Design a protein around this motif. Structure first.
Motif, PDB file in Angstrom:
ATOM      1  N   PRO B 169       0.828  -1.209   0.000  1.00 45.52           N
ATOM      2  CA  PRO B 169       0.000   0.000   0.000  1.00 45.52           C
ATOM      3  C   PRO B 169       0.856   1.250   0.000  1.00 45.52           C
ATOM      4  O   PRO B 169       2.061   1.187   0.282  1.00 45.52           O
ATOM      5  N   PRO B 170       0.271   2.407  -0.303  1.00 48.44           N
ATOM      6  CA  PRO B 170       1.052   3.649  -0.235  1.00 48.44           C
ATOM      7  C   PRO B 170       1.647   3.920   1.135  1.00 48.44           C
ATOM      8  O   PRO B 170       2.765   4.445   1.218  1.00 48.44           O
ATOM      9  N   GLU B 171       0.941   3.582   2.216  1.00 46.69           N
ATOM     10  CA  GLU B 171       1.424   3.921   3.550  1.00 46.69           C
ATOM     11  C   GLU B 171       2.597   3.055   3.983  1.00 46.69           C
ATOM     12  O   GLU B 171       3.396   3.492   4.817  1.00 46.69           O
ATOM     13  N   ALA B 172       2.721   1.842   3.447  1.00 46.69           N
ATOM     14  CA  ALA B 172       3.832   0.981   3.829  1.00 46.69           C
ATOM     15  C   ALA B 172       5.179   1.585   3.469  1.00 46.69           C
ATOM     16  O   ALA B 172       6.187   1.231   4.088  1.00 46.69           O
ATOM     17  N   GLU B 174       6.042   4.662   4.014  1.00 43.02           N
ATOM     18  CA  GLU B 174       6.400   5.556   5.107  1.00 43.02           C
ATOM     19  C   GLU B 174       6.412   4.869   6.463  1.00 43.02           C
ATOM     20  O   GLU B 174       7.002   5.401   7.408  1.00 43.02           O
ATOM     21  N   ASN B 175       5.773   3.709   6.584  1.00 43.06           N
ATOM     22  CA  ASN B 175       5.710   2.988   7.854  1.00 43.06           C
ATOM     23  C   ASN B 175       5.565   1.509   7.549  1.00 43.06           C
ATOM     24  O   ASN B 175       4.471   0.941   7.648  1.00 43.06           O
ATOM     25  N   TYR B 178       3.132  -1.044   9.418  1.00 36.45           N
ATOM     26  CA  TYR B 178       1.720  -0.725   9.596  1.00 36.45           C
ATOM     27  C   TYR B 178       0.878  -1.970   9.862  1.00 36.45           C
ATOM     28  O   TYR B 178      -0.051  -1.934  10.676  1.00 36.45           O
ATOM     29  N   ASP B 179       1.183  -3.084   9.193  1.00 40.81           N
ATOM     30  CA  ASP B 179       0.300  -4.241   9.266  1.00 40.81           C
ATOM     31  C   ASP B 179       0.314  -4.905  10.635  1.00 40.81           C
ATOM     32  O   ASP B 179      -0.608  -5.668  10.940  1.00 40.81           O
ATOM     33  N   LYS B 181       0.424  -2.895  13.286  1.00 41.85           N
ATOM     34  CA  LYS B 181      -0.096  -1.807  14.112  1.00 41.85           C
ATOM     35  C   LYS B 181       1.000  -1.192  14.979  1.00 41.85           C
ATOM     36  O   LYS B 181       0.893  -1.137  16.206  1.00 41.85           O
ATOM     37  N   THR B 183       4.822   1.620  14.470  1.00 40.06           N
ATOM     38  CA  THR B 183       5.543   2.570  13.633  1.00 40.06           C
ATOM     39  C   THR B 183       7.027   2.228  13.607  1.00 40.06           C
ATOM     40  O   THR B 183       7.593   1.823  14.627  1.00 40.06           O
ATOM     41  N   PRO B 186      11.268   4.171   7.507  1.00 33.88           N
ATOM     42  CA  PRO B 186      11.368   3.573   6.173  1.00 33.88           C
ATOM     43  C   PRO B 186      12.717   2.897   5.987  1.00 33.88           C
ATOM     44  O   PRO B 186      13.711   3.274   6.609  1.00 33.88           O
TER      45      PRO B 186
END
Lengths: 592, 481
Positions: B169-172, B174-175, B178-179, B181, B183, B186
């Motif tokens: 995903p786009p957020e992965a 930057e973090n 994420y999956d 839960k 932080t 990168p």
């Protein structure tokens, strides 16, 4: 020893990695033959696709113009409203190219697709198969086993090959947590079951390796592939390199080509040598049994001193009827040259009766522009001394030229009866074609009618005067032959001189009769395959008042030279004499 | 006499000396015709030959810099000496040989540089937590051994490219955590953090603000960081006069050269420094991993001792890798890096418990043999190494240099150096395969008949065609009978 050095150079767009993968295209529908060159980073006209890569078809005759072949002309498909199903940008299309008859197979190992279950970017990889007027996509790893632990990261198409039975072999080094995987499908099923609206097609006769225990993770099975029969049933079996297996010692697996059952394993000797980077299966010693060649580009050898140095190594394994293998190893010649990076069977390069093989050192040579070594097979195996060296000519722009990183042979593009070779230089975006020169075999005869010269014999008469002088006759013969396309008759310049051993500028014993000279030159024309053509000359010894030496025997020496300029064909390809046959012949005669 | 020199008719001094090292030449014209000009040295004196006329060069070794070995490492940096003699000059004849000795001492209290290179994958979060105050503890322990400690820090995860990096995903991007839960930073290839400094508190300050990252595959991109921390002298801050320790901590397998092809990276590692002003290894996504040969070469050039501090599951793998890299040792790192300090201290002890010699720029015409007088007065033949030492021990090697022919270039100096040390012995080899009298020979000399031959060192040397001892005739026209 017969590759020419006035080759044909093909150039692609700058930065396209043109020449990364090379192969011949020999359609059965026409006499024309073309080169296939992969340009994995070439920009294309596909809507919205950046550096998708392409494959170019370059003709040998005519102007030698390279033109792309349109496997695909569409952008990314949409799974739903404005959510792409595919990511073709930077897919490295054309990183591997293989063809058989009119079938062309090209793969894009870095092709990412959005799974049907989740929004994802998984490098499953894809391939395109063109069999004439029709093109079909082939993505065996784009299945519903979508994950890293499945085969989502398969990168299918990293390497490929064709079997004799019209069956494809494809390797994906990323399947099952990078354990790797080999997938083989029949070309008939690939074409007949293609459906653009089905993204995960199931083929009935597919053969694929299954997942194993976690101990085998990061083995990269399928990094390289090759095919050959290794159990004696007529069906090509699968050979694959596993460079990271066995704690990075490297390994090579051979799988049955009928049911994907394991047959043999090869293991490396040195850690991190990448044993298995390249593999090749070809018969190098005149048997029906194919032989396995394995490259270890980073193998570190120990020099005269105990210090290790990275030279590379290639392992040669001769198959035996009992199933065992006889193994010998070739070490590189230069440090950091990565000898063994690419191995390309050449077929019988000089029609010697045994196949020949080429091994590349893309970073060796002066200025590190690349070197390719030509080895000749023998009944006892491979000849460990290279018979020729091909050197890269282009200097680096911003990256090593990598001349020799990819090679392909075993095909005669100009139909002169000898297979040719294509060498890739993707570092400078160039591919070069070397043509094999016809090989001429020559047998030279030389004898003197009397073996021992007695000086009291005065039978011959001195021409132009009444003197009678001891004489003898020297007869020399020349016979030549060779396979392939050659002119019916060849011109040899034959040089004769006598008393050669003592030619320090001193007195000369023998002399030719008519020419009053110690040497003779004759331009002789000989026809291929004919009987020994012969000529005779009369020579005589000087009187006793001229020289004292009765000890050193008289010697006759013969040297012959082929007139290559005339023998060249219409395209300017000159023949060459056999390497082993000596260029001179001599005989001794005593004086009493 | 039937000496080797008399076994053949050497033309002149230029050939007489090349026959064998004990051959000698006599230049006097009074030398009787029945006495060969080439023979053993003593024979020419038994016959009538002026001692000053006999050239007979001999081989010798001269010491040029012979400073004494130091006692302790503290003090003037330019004065500390660990190898003596520092420079010697060799004059030798074709196929000759000479012997000279080199003394190596591992001085105590030598300045030390420690660069802590840490794996920052997600499994190293606890390791990072445990070492948050390693700077002060490390300074306290190393005080017993060295008084000029300097330490630094650096981190690596892997090449930030697919398939190693999460991009799903786009957020992965930057973090990547994420999956699960949580932080995390990168992914990054290599990141220089702290330049080698003696302000040990800054090591604590800087390591507390580091954060782990997350990659997909198990193998790490450590070797890229090892290469970059070696060739980037200016940023890392290696001292020319100090012991260089590169501590490499990891708990996972490692990527090796030619692995980058899966990611679309086919350019070989060039071995240059590519760490920019942002302290990130810029060429991470463009250049392949380095090979063991290149890493070994760069480590040898920069005199870096590399220590593998790896967990149990990979100790055997890294031991096998270290077997191929001279000057490296392996230690067992705990699952939380709680024992890294003792591991470092022990590794430093082992590194300075062994002396090994290496040679650079050795001409192909020369060959070397080593006899090692390791520890007490007993010699182990054929070994260029000595083990079981302790800091302060003095070891002596005896070396023999052997010639092969006579190169055209008469000066081909080379270097002999212990592994991991800046101090070295430089050999100024001078090939003495020549005769001084040649420069003053009379060309086309009338000393010979009709100027037919040069008067080389007291004997005629005919020009083209001419023959004879006095160069009398142009042809023979001669019979022994």
């Amino acid at each position: 020893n017969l590759d020419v050095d006035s080759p044909a150079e093909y150039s692609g767009p700058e930065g396209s990695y043109f020449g990364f993968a090379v192969d011949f295209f020999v359609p059965s529908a026409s006499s024309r033959m073309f080169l296939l060159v992969g340009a994995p980073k070439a920009n294309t006209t596909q809507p919205g696709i950046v550096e998708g890569g392409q494959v170019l078809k370059c003709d040998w005759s005519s102007t030698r113009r390279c033109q792309p072949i349109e496997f695909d002309a569409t952008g990314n498909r949409d799974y739903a409203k404005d959510d792409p199903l595919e990511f073709k940008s930077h897919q490295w299309f054309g990183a591997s190219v293989r063809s058989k008859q009119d079938k062309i197979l090209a793969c894009a190992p870095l092709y990412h697709w959005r799974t049907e279950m989740k929004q994802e970017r998984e490098p499953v990889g894809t391939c395109f198969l063109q069999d004439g007027t029709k093109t079909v996509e082939y993505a065996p790893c784009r299945s519903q086993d979508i994950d890293a632990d499945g085969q989502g990261f398969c990168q299918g198409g990293f390497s490929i090959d064709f079997t004799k039975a019209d069956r494809v072999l494809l390797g994906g080094p990323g399947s099952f947590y990078w354990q790797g995987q080999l997938i083989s499908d029949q070309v008939a099923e690939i074409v007949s079951k293609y459906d653009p609206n089905v993204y995960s097609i199931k083929y009935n006769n597919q053969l694929a390796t299954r997942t194993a225990q976690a101990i085998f993770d990061d083995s990269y099975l399928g990094y390289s592939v090759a095919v050959g029969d290794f159990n004696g049933d007529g069906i090509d079996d699968f050979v694959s390199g596993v460079p990271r297996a066995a704690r990075t010692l490297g390994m090579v697996y051979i799988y049955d080509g009928k049911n994907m059952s394991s047959l043999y394993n090869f293991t490396g000797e040195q850690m991190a040598a990448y044993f298995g980077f390249s593999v090749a299966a070809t018969d190098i010693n005149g048997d029906d049994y194919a032989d396995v060649f394995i490259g270890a580009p980073l193998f570190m050898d120990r020099g005269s001193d105990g210090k290790l140095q990275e030279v590379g190594q290639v392992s040669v394994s001769l198959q035996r009827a009992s199933g065992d293998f006889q193994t010998t190893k070739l070490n590189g010649f230069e440090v950091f040259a990565r000898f063994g990076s690419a191995i390309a069977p050449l077929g019988d390069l000089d029609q010697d009766g045994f196949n020949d093989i080429a091994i590349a050192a893309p970073y060796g040579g002066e200025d590190k522009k690349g070197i390719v070594y030509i080895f000749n097979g023998r009944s006892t195996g491979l000849n460990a001394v290279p018979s020729q060296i091909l050197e890269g000519q282009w200097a680096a722009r911003s990256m090593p030229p990598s001349f020799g990183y990819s090679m392909k042979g075993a095909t005669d593009i100009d139909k002169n009866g000898y297979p040719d070779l294509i060498v890739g230089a993707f570092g400078v975006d160039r591919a070069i074609l070397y043509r094999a020169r016809p090989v001429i075999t020559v047998n030279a005869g030389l004898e003197v009618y009397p073996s021992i010269l007695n000086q009291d014999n005065k039978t011959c008469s001195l021409p132009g005067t009444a003197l009678k002088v001891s004489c003898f006759n020297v007869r020399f013969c020349l016979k030549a032959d060779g396979k392939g396309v050659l002119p019916r008759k060849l011109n040899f310049q034959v040089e004769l001189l006598l008393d050669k051993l003592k030619q320090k500028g001193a007195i000369r014993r023998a002399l030719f009769l008519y020419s009053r000279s110690p040497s003779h030159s004759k331009n002789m024309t000989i026809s291929r395959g004919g009987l020994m053509q012969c000529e005779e000359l009369i020579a005589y010894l000087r009187d006793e008042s001229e020289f004292r030496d009765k000890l050193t025997p008289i010697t006759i020496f013969m040297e012959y030279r082929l007139d290559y300029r005339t023998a060249a064909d219409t395209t300017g390809l000159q023949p060459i004499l056999n390497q082993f046959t000596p260029a001179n012949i001599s005989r001794q005669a005593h004086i009493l | 006499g039937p000496n080797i020199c008399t076994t053949r008719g050497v033309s002149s001094c230029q050939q007489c000396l090349a026959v064998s090292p004990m051959c000698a030449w006599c230049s006097d014209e009074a030398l009787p015709l029945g006495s060969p000009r080439c023979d053993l040295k003593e024979n020419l004196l038994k016959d009538n030959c002026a001692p000053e006329s006999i050239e007979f060069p001999v081989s010798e070794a001269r010491v040029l810099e012979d400073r004494p070995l130091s006692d302790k490492g503290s003090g003037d940096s330019s004065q500390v000496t660990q190898v003596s003699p520092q420079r010697i000059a060799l004059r030798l004849r074709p196929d000759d040989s000479k012997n000279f000795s080199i003394q190596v001492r591992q001085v105590e209290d030598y300045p030390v540089d420690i660069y802590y290179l840490m794996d920052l994958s997600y499994s190293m979060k606890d390791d990072l937590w445990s070492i948050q105050n390693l700077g002060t503890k490390l300074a306290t322990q190393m005080r017993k051994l060295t008084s000029n400690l300097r330490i630094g820090f650096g981190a690596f995860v892997d090449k930030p490219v697919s398939p190693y990096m999460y991009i799903s995903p786009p957020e992965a991007l930057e973090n990547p955590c994420y999956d699960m839960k949580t932080t995390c930073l990168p992914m990054f290839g290599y990141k220089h953090v702290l330049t080698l400094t003696d302000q040990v508190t800054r090591f604590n300050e800087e390591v507390k603000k580091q954060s782990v990252s997350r990659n997909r595959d198990a193998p790490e991109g450590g070797f890229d960081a090892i290469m970059q921390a070696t060739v980037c002298d200016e940023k890392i801050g290696w001292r020319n006069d100090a012991s260089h320790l590169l501590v490499f901590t990891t708990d996972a397998k490692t990527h090796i050269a030619l692995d980058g092809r899966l990611a679309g990276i086919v350019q070989p590692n060039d071995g240059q420094c590519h760490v920019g002003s942002d302290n990130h290894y810029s060429a991470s996504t463009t250049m392949d991993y380095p090979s063991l040969g290149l890493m070994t070469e760069k480590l040898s050039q920069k005199n870096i001792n590399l220590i593998f501090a790896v967990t149990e599951n990979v100790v055997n793998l890294y031991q096998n890798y270290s077997e191929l890299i001279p000057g490296t040792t392996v230690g067992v790192l705990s699952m939380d890096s709680s024992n890294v300090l003792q591991l470092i201290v022990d590794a430093y002890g082992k590194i300075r418990s062994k002396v090994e010699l290496e040679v650079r720029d050795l001409p192909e015409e020369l060959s070397l043999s080593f006899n090692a007088t390791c520890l007490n007065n007993e010699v182990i033949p054929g070994l260029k190494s000595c083990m079981g030492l302790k800091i302060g021990d003095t070891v002596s090697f005896s070396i023999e240099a052997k010639v092969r022919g006579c190169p055209q270039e008469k000066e081909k100096s080379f270097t002999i150096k212990p592994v991991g040390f800046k101090d070295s012995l430089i050999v100024q080899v001078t090939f003495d395969c020549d005769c001084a009298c040649q420069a003053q020979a009379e060309p086309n000399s009338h000393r010979c008949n009709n100027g037919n031959g040069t008067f080389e060192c007291g004997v005629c040397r005919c020009g083209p065609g001419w023959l004879g001892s006095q160069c009398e005739c142009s042809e023979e026209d001669y019979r022994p009978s």
